[PDB]
């Protein structure tokens, strides 16, 4: 709501946490030491 | 893909989906804060208000490391009666390098348990963890070694469900999840016995099916491979597979080495199926001895295929279940792990695989001194992982041909959940996990017509509600 988005906004909180788990993400393929692995992601996380 | 079809039966994977906080009961009686003391802690602090707000009442319970299995009891017995204990000991803690399981967190938890056993107590125990579980691998574990303690954890309550409360990840520095959340989770009616508090809320460990659409992507065994406990069936059919897939040089590694009962069949097997096998009586455990280990490997063929197998156990029950007990009980598994990791943190392998069981997967009476140790090796794949470095922790169910995993543990659940595994399979199996890189599969063959009133029996739980076919 936004009202709840000032207090995230006002005293300074990141939203970046993670990658969902709710969706039935992979979450293991999307992450590999290569970094042009096809089916990899870059970020470990952001707002969700 | 019809043959994989068993793989995907076989796989599965441990993933933690936001479950709730728990339902928030007005405590009574009092609620220890156990901990150390070297150090002041605002960790203290954070879960002091929780309680005190709770309901119940807070005291300090310091606790040494090793100080007695029955110290905490009388501790207990003077304080009088407890709803629970909240063990902040394993918080901001950093690891003993001298052995992953000499963990003074682990040891205290364990001469806990055993306080609240011998103190006809009854009170749930709740161990705070400071990032010591991932809830994905967008998360670093901080210490693999604190994920010993979650092992141990699931291990113990198959045996003092009224005793053991669960485990409650926070993250590394920040107390406020626990100010948040502790006093709805550790009187939670939800049930988990997992928990990971986060900026994003609460997450419970779940058993996940893991997808295997056979990816394309082949991994081969080209290079030496470094067969930890080659010799014992667990490094033994891996290394038989690996021979038979085209590996150029083998490199099995064991104390026993040469003075194994099997190793001369074992050796004149792979050289039959592969080529370049050797057998090594070399000790895993010292640092300076698989440095000179790796040393000693030609310079011909680089090392990209450490598959660590070594693994050393004869009880796992809790009632002697000592931390330093446990460091001696299972030390070629943590520290050979550990040593090869930091050896090959300047090789490039494409392959490490971790050989670790479902001690640390699900809980299983008798293999409480295996969990720690197979926890480790999870949590060290998930970090090599998470660092640019190549991992994998496969949990094999019970090795149908190895015995070091085969115990009076293997045939007991043989009867009641997991089964015997062919070999023909789990190797592919682990083909199938290093395809897509996976960070920790766990291949088992668990039944859950017969898993169902053995494990969810003493204590019902969320951990198997992912699993579509887990309802029976």
């Given at each position: 709501?936004?009202?709840?988005?000032?207090?995230?906004?006002?005293?300074?909180?990141?939203?970046?946490?993670?990658?969902?788990?709710?969706?039935?993400?992979?979450?293991?393929?999307?992450?590999?030491?290569?970094?042009?692995?096809?089916?990899?992601?870059?970020?470990?996380?952001?707002?969700? | 893909?019809?043959?994989?079809?068993?793989?995907?039966?076989?796989?599965?994977?441990?993933?933690?989906?936001?479950?709730?906080?728990?339902?928030?009961?007005?405590?009574?009686?009092?609620?220890?804060?156990?901990?150390?003391?070297?150090?002041?802690?605002?960790?203290?602090?954070?879960?002091?208000?929780?309680?005190?707000?709770?309901?119940?009442?807070?005291?300090?319970?310091?606790?040494?490391?090793?100080?007695?299995?029955?110290?905490?009891?009388?501790?207990?017995?003077?304080?009088?009666?407890?709803?629970?204990?909240?063990?902040?000991?394993?918080?901001?803690?950093?690891?003993?390098?001298?052995?992953?399981?000499?963990?003074?967190?682990?040891?205290?938890?364990?001469?806990?348990?055993?306080?609240?056993?011998?103190?006809?107590?009854?009170?749930?125990l709740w161990t705070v963890t400071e990032s010591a579980v991932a809830t994905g691998p967008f998360e670093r574990?901080?210490?693999?070694?604190?994920?010993?303690?979650?092992?141990?954890?699931?291990?113990?309550?198959?045996?003092?469900?009224?005793?053991?409360?669960?485990?409650?990840?926070?993250?590394?520095?920040?107390?406020?999840?626990?100010?948040?959340?502790?006093?709805?989770?550790?009187?939670?009616?939800?049930?988990?016995?997992?928990?990971?508090?986060?900026?994003?809320?609460?997450?419970?460990?779940?058993?996940?099916?893991?997808?295997?659409?056979?990816?394309?992507?082949?991994?081969?065994?080209?290079?030496?491979?470094?067969?930890?406990?080659?010799?014992?069936?667990?490094?033994?059919?891996?290394?038989?597979?690996?021979?038979?897939?085209?590996?150029?040089?083998?490199?099995?590694?064991?104390?026993?080495?040469?003075?194994?009962?099997?190793?001369?069949?074992?050796?004149?097997?792979?050289?039959?199926?592969?080529?370049?096998?050797?057998?090594?009586?070399?000790?895993?455990?010292?640092?300076?001895?698989?440095?000179?280990?790796?040393?000693?490997?030609?310079?011909?063929?680089?090392?990209?295929?450490?598959?660590?197998?070594?693994?050393?156990?004869?009880?796992?029950?809790?009632?002697?279940?000592?931390?330093?007990?446990?460091?001696?009980?299972?030390?070629?598994?943590?520290?050979?792990?550990?040593?090869?990791?930091?050896?090959?943190?300047?090789?490039?392998?494409?392959?490490?695989?971790?050989?670790?069981?479902?001690?640390?997967a699900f809980g299983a009476p008798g293999l409480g001194g295996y969990a720690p140790g197979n926890a480790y090796?999870?949590?060290?794949?998930?970090?090599?992982?998470?660092?640019?470095?190549?991992?994998?922790?496969?949990?094999?169910?019970?090795?149908?041909?190895?015995?070091?995993?085969?115990?009076?543990?293997?045939?007991?659940?043989?009867?009641?959940?997991?089964?015997?595994?062919?070999?023909?399979?789990?190797?592919?199996?682990?083909?199938?996990?290093?395809?897509?890189?996976?960070?920790?599969?766990?291949?088992?063959?668990?039944?859950?017509?017969?898993?169902?009133?053995?494990?969810?029996?003493?204590?019902?739980?969320?951990?198997?509600?992912?699993?579509?076919?887990?309802?029976?």
């Open positions: 709501t936004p009202e709840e988005f000032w207090e995230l906004l006002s005293e300074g909180r990141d939203a970046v946490a993670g990658l969902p788990t709710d969706r039935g993400w992979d979450l293991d393929s999307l992450f590999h030491p290569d970094p042009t692995r096809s089916g990899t992601a870059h970020q470990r996380g952001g707002g969700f | 893909s019809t043959e994989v079809d068993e793989v995907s039966a076989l796989r599965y994977r441990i993933e933690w989906r936001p479950t709730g906080a728990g339902e928030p009961a007005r405590l009574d009686g009092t609620w220890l804060v156990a901990k150390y003391a070297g150090t002041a802690d605002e960790t203290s602090t954070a879960a002091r208000e929780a309680l005190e707000s709770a309901g119940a009442r807070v005291r300090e319970l310091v606790v040494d490391a090793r100080c007695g299995r029955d110290e905490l009891a009388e501790r207990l017995r003077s304080v009088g009666e407890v709803a629970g204990v909240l063990s902040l000991l394993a918080v901001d803690e950093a690891e003993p390098e001298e052995a992953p399981l000499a963990l003074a967190s682990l040891a205290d938890t364990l001469s806990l348990v055993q306080a609240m056993v011998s103190a006809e107590l009854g009170c749930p574990v901080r210490n693999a070694a604190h994920g010993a303690l979650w092992g141990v954890g699931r291990v113990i309550a198959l045996e003092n469900p009224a005793v053991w409360g669960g485990l409650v990840d926070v993250p590394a520095g920040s107390v406020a999840e626990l100010a948040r959340h502790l006093a709805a989770v550790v009187s939670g009616g939800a049930g988990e016995d997992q928990l990971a508090l986060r900026a994003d809320g609460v997450y419970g460990r779940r058993w996940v099916r893991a997808a295997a659409p056979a990816t394309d992507d082949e991994w081969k065994p080209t290079g030496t491979v470094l067969v930890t406990g080659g010799t014992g069936g667990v490094g033994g059919q891996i290394a038989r597979w690996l021979a038979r897939r085209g590996a150029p040089h083998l490199l099995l590694v064991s104390r026993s080495g040469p003075d194994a009962d099997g190793a001369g069949e074992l050796v004149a097997e792979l050289e039959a199926l592969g080529a370049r096998t050797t057998v090594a009586a070399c000790d895993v455990t010292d640092r300076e001895s698989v440095r000179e280990l790796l040393g000693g490997i030609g310079d011909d063929v680089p090392l990209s295929a450490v598959f660590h197998a070594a693994a050393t156990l004869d009880d796992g029950t809790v009632d002697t279940l000592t931390g330093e007990r446990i460091e001696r009980a299972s030390r070629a598994k943590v520290l050979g792990a550990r040593n090869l990791h930091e050896l090959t943190r300047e090789l490039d392998l494409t392959a490490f695989v971790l050989f670790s069981s479902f001690a640390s090796l999870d949590g060290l794949a998930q970090q090599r992982r998470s660092d640019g470095l190549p991992a994998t922790a496969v949990a094999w169910g019970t090795w149908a041909g190895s015995g070091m995993a085969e115990g009076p543990v293997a045939d007991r659940f043989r009867r009641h959940g997991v089964i015997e595994m062919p070999p023909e399979t789990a190797c592919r199996a682990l083909q199938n996990a290093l395809d897509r890189a996976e960070v920790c599969p766990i291949v088992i063959d668990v039944r859950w017509d017969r898993f169902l009133l053995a494990y969810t029996a003493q204590r019902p739980t969320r951990l198997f509600d992912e699993i579509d076919d887990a309802r029976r």
